[PDB]
């Protein structure tokens, strides 16, 4: 949802307050992707056990 997928690009363009709005979509999107990976590892770990 952010304008760009690079942190340095949004930080050097949008203002700190505006970048936080875009950074929120970056972190929120990455958190859902990070938790999805950890959730799959816990499920895959159970099958290995």
């Amino acid at each position: 949802g952010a304008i760009s997928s690079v942190l340095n690009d949004i930080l050097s363009r949008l203002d700190p307050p505006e970048a936080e709005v875009q950074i929120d979509r970056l972190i929120t999107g990455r958190l859902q992707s990070l938790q999805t990976y950890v959730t799959q590892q816990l499920i895959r770990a159970a099958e290995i056990r």
Partner: protein, 48 residues
Amino acid sequence: VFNATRFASVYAWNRKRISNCVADYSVLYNSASFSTFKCYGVSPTKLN
């Protein structure tokens, strides 16, 4: 562009391409001349 005597019309406006040069944006931002200065794409202090 900025200091030109007479700009073109808003109906048909003059588009000037600026490439291969040194852009100093501090003279325009710091000095008080123009009333409205705002940057939508980037920050006004990071222009340089």
